[PDB]
Every structure is written in C-alpha cells, then in structure tokens.
Design a protein around this ligand. Structure first.
Ligand SMILES: *[C@@H]1O[C@H](CO)[C@@H](O[C@@H]2O[C@H](CO)[C@@H](O[C@@H]3O[C@H](CO[C@H]4O[C@H](CO)[C@@H](O)[C@H](O)[C@@H]4O)[C@@H](O)[C@H](O)[C@@H]3O)[C@H](O)[C@H]2NC(C)=O)[C@H](O)[C@H]1NC(C)=O
Ligand SMILES: [Cl-]
Lengths: 214, 217
C-alpha cells in the first residue's frame, strides 16, 4: 500500500491569512494526489485532484502542488467557511489510502466565558441522585480549566465534562461540567463552587451556591 | 446531483450481522465503483472494500474474511454485511464513489457516514431535568437556562428549544458516558424568562421517545 503521511495534525489561523498542509507518499505516485475538506453536517468534499487540478467549483484561493512523493495544499485569504478538516487521498493505485487529517482552527479575539452554575432539580433529587452543572459559554481560546469545590475542598471524583466544536456564528467554544453525587452526599455539604481559569482573567472566575438557600 | 446515503442500525449487539446500505442517486452503479470506508474511534480512514462497476468485489486483505459486499442495481443500493464486531466500538462507516477511464479518479462524492454502536446493552430513554438558576443566585437581564438529558443509550439524541422557535445561544454539548449510559446538557439564553416560557424538546429515536421539559423556578 502507499502510506500517506500528512502534517500537521493542527493549524490555527485568522480569516484572511494563509496556511499550507503537506502530504508525503511512501512511494512515488506521479501527480495522483487529491485533497478533501470535511465539515460537520457535510459529506467529505473533493477540492483538488491530480496534485494541482481544481474540481469545478473550488475557489481560486485553494491551490495544490507536487509530483512524486511530496504534495502541498495551500489555502490563501482564508474564509470562515474554510475552517474545518482537510485530508489527502492518493489515487494512483488501490487500495485507496489517506492522510490522517489536519484540523484548521479559526483564530479570533479572546472572549471570556459566561459562567453559570445550576443546583440539582427537585425532580432529580426525587430519584436519590444529584447533578450540579457548571457551564462556561462562548469563550476563546480553547484552553480552559475548571475546578469543583465542595465546602472549600476540591472534588475531582464524579466530575465529567465536554466541550463543543467551534461555534459556526462566533467561532467560540463552550464547556459543560457536571458533578454527580448521591442525594445523601449532596445534602451532607453546604457550599458548591465551580472555579474556572482562562487566559482572559488574571485570577479564576468563581460561581457558587449554598445548598442551605435552595 | 450525485448523492450517496448510508443507512443501517444505530445499535448492534456483539456478533449480530451488521448490514449497511449505501443508496445512490444521479449515477448508474454499472458506471462507477462504490467503496466502503470506516473511521474507527480516534483514527483515520480505513478502506474496507469496493463494489466494482462490473459486478466484482475486492476487500481489504486483513478484513476480507469478515466482510461481504454486494449490490442491487435496480434499487440503486450497495450493501456491506459484516460480522465479529467489537464490544463498545462506535465506528463510522462511509460509502464513496470513483471510476477509472483514462485514469483513476479519487473519490469524487462521499456519503455523510453513519455511526454504529456495538453493545449488548438495552436501549434506555433519558430522564430530562431543568437547568435553572436557584439557591440565591441573582438573575441578570439575560439568563442562561438548560436541560440535563441523563441516562440514555445509545446515541444519539436531539434537543430543540421552544419547538425550534428559540435559537439564541443554543449549545448542545457532547454527551459523556458513564456506567454504560450517556448524559448531555443543552443550554439557551433568554432575556424574557420567566414571564415567557422556555421548553426543551428532547428526542431519543432509539427508544422512540420525545419529551418536553419546561424550565421554570
Ligand atoms: C485494512 O484494514 C486494516 C484493519 O484490519 C487497517 O489497519 C489499521 O491500519 C491503521 C493504519 O496503519 C493502524 O493505525 C495505526 O496504529 C498504530 C499502532 O497503534 C498502537 O500502538 C502504538 C505503539 O504501541 C500506540 O502509540 C498507539 O496509540 C496504539 O496503541 C499507530 O502507531 C499509528 O499511528 C496508527 O494509528 C491500525 O491500528 C490498523 N488496525 C488494525 C486493527 O490492525 C488498514 O488501514 C486497512 N487498509 C487500508 C488500505 O485502509
Ligand atoms: Cl513520480
């Protein structure tokens, strides 16, 4: 098989800037390398083929070079719509083989998270369980860390979290963190705090509630 | 336009036959090859095999013994049947088209892929709980509300707000798995709550459930 090595795994750039992405075949394959774009909610889309030929409809800011082993996709003058994942496929021989992909992040201005904390619902406590939720919405950059504290002591047990992909309208991220515990555990403590560190604040953003006020 | 569409079960059990269908339109199966490709969890694309235009098949040599590809030209369908699945895997499977005339095209059109969950677990509908500020938290002019969609299996769900009418700062987060069940949150903002009602609509196709939860109080 022709092994395709793609680099890098990741890029970040601003709209209007230029990036390039490399693929390198393990054997010479003449000009027969194609580039594709992947974007949530869309089938993988053929951009370039035979190294440098644009598919009909591909904007002129995309270009490709190379013949032999070494290929490069260049994207100039980036549009928002161009942020997503790219991969290469050789089309010299079967089996089809593919690069491992490059995720291109849209670099926008810093944005501080809007932090919200939510006590368990009485509906859920009826079941004997409790979930405390902390949302950290519409922030940039991705880098973030969240601590839960219960009566001033860090709790990492029973915490799960996840982060959205970059927003289609404002290019931010959002994170949700859930502290799960028994009703008995929940009711054995008073102060619930989620503590959120992000480069937009010189010290942590803190949201807390006292269960005794619920 | 050219289209390829994968379909199959969202959940199989270990050792059940996994039957996938690729339904095509806007070209003839006797004129183009249709390939099957998978993307395991974590990973890049892996070629599984091809339904050649002329009716033969070829396979990834390491997977050959576990795959069967076929088609029904009258129905514009290509099939992939496989067996010996991997407990707890959530692979995505794709079909894609190519041809060879003077040269071999790359794959010019793809389907959007389907994800299959492999498990012996039961289908389980979510409980839906409100996310509302409480417990002495002063409510700003714009409030963040949400719904906690807890304890469902398998993926996916969908969440909408006020039946689609509300789409201000909607975020539906990736689900997390623990003790074999998924939990996700979905949030929206409102400047008019609680005078104006905010309701999440949660669908879980696998369990045939659709539940509304009005967020108040
Ligand atoms: C035909 O089907 C084959 C499956 O039967 C496909 O095989 C897969 O091929 C990919 C690409 O070569 C492999 O992915 C690589 O895995 C290695 C090994 O990773 C593990 O070990 C290292 C070191 O201990 C560790 O760093 C990793 O995290 C893993 O624990 C990685 O080093 C590579 O980066 C890459 O991910 C698959 O592992 C392999 N699967 C199996 C089940 O063998 C093959 O791609 C198909 N052929 C075609 C043409 O698509
Ligand atoms: Cl060459």
């Amino acid at each position: 098989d022709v092994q395709m090595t793609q680099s890098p795994s990741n890029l970040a750039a601003s709209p209007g800037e230029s990036v390039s992405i490399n693929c390198k075949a393990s054997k010479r394959i003449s000009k027969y390398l194609a580039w594709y774009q992947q974007k949530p909610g869309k089938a993988n889309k053929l951009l370039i083929y035979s190294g440098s030929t644009l598919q009909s409809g591909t904007p002129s800011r995309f270009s490709g070079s190379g013949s032999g082993t070494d290929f490069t996709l260049t994207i100039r003058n980036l549009e928002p719509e161009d942020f997503g994942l790219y991969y290469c496929q050789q089309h010299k021989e079967y089996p089809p083989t593919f690069g491992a992909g490059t995720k291109l992040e849209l670099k926008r201005a810093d944005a501080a998270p809007t932090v919200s904390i939510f006590p368990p619902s009485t509906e859920q406590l009826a079941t004997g369980g409790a979930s405390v939720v902390c949302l950290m919405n519409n922030f940039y950059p991705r880098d973030i860390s969240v601590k839960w504290k219960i009566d001033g002591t860090e709790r990492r047990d029973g915490v799960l979290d996840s982060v959205t992909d970059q927003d289609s309208k404002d290019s931010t991220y959002s994170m949700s963190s859930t502290l799960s515990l028994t009703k008995a555990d929940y009711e054995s403590h008073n102060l619930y705090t989620c503590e959120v560190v992000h480069k937009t604040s010189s010290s942590p953003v803190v949201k807390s509630f006292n269960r005794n006020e619920c | 336009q050219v289209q390829l569409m994968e379909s199959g079960p969202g959940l199989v059990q270990p050792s059940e036959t996994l039957s996938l269908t690729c339904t095509v339109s806007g070209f003839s199966l006797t004129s183009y090859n249709v390939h099957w490709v998978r993307q395991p969890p974590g990973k890049g694309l892996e070629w599984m095999g091809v339904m050649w235009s002329g009716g033969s098949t070829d396979y990834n040599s390491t997977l050959k013994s576990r795959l069967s590809i076929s088609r029904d030209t009258s129905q514009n369908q290509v099939f992939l049947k496989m067996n010996s699945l991997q407990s707890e895997d959530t692979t995505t499977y794709y079909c894609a088209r190519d041809r060879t005339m003077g040269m071999t095209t790359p794959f010019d059109y793809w389907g959007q892929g389907v994800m299959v969950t492999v498990s012996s677990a039961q289908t389980t509908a979510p409980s839906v709980y409100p996310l509302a500020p409480g417990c002495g938290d002063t409510t700003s002019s714009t409030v963040t509300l949400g719904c906690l969609v807890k304890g469902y299996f398998p993926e996916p769900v969908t969440v909408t707000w006020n039946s689609g009418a509300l789409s201000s700062d909607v975020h539906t987060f990736p689900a997390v798995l623990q003790s074999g069940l998924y939990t996700l949150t979905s949030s929206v903002t409102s400047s008019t709550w609680p005078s104006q009602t905010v309701t999440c609509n949660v669908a879980h196709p696998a369990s045939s459930t659709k539940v509304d939860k009005k967020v108040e109080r």
